[PDB]
UniProtKB/Swiss-Prot annotation, chains A, B:
Disulfide bonds: none annotated. It comes from Mycobacterium tuberculosis (strain CDC 1551 / Oshkosh). To M.tuberculosis Rv2632c. Gene3D superfamilies: Rv1738. It comes from the Bacteria. Induction: A member of the dormancy regulon. Induced in response to reduced oxygen tension (hypoxia) and low levels of nitric oxide (NO). It holds the Pfam family Rv2632c-like. This is Uncharacterized protein MT1780.
Length: 88, 88
């Protein structure tokens, strides 16, 4: 009675000179998105690169989810033929 | 000069009787999070399950990113020994 699926987000993390850039790619059906996030270390945490990693990724995933809400909106509008906007 | 990493988010999608539930799991270093999202179809799009899929996943990824911002906050606070809060 349930229909189950499994998807994957691929995340790249690039640390360079205290700047960490994350890119989170998701492909599904007819769509593909990349969420992007940045985190820069400061003197107080410059020796804790794990913070830059997880913060840039948090941002990339949030960006990805935001972009996906927009795709969802476009698909709903295609069905209803009425403008829509999803806030959450 | 760059340090590169690659991480993966695992997403489950469960459709049942018009309700779609997505769970997005990320493990990294010393942490593990699951973001959760729901989408329920309505009569106007009940025959477009792809909308429930992508909307529940958008929500799960947004939830995951929000939870990860909180983990990042805790880690920053552990370094600075000062309360913090990351809005984005």
């Amino acid at each position: 009675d349930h229909v189950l699926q499994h998807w994957t987000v691929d995340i790249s993390i690039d640390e360079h000179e205290g700047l960490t850039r994350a890119k989170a790619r998701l492909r599904w059906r007819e769509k593909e998105l990349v969420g992007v996030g940045l985190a820069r270390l400061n003197p107080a945490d410059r020796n804790v690169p794990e913070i830059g990693d997880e913060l840039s990724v948090a941002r990339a995933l949030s960006d990805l989810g935001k972009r996906m809400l927009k795709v969802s909106t476009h698909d709903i509008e295609a069905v209803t033929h009425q403008p829509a906007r999803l806030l959450y």
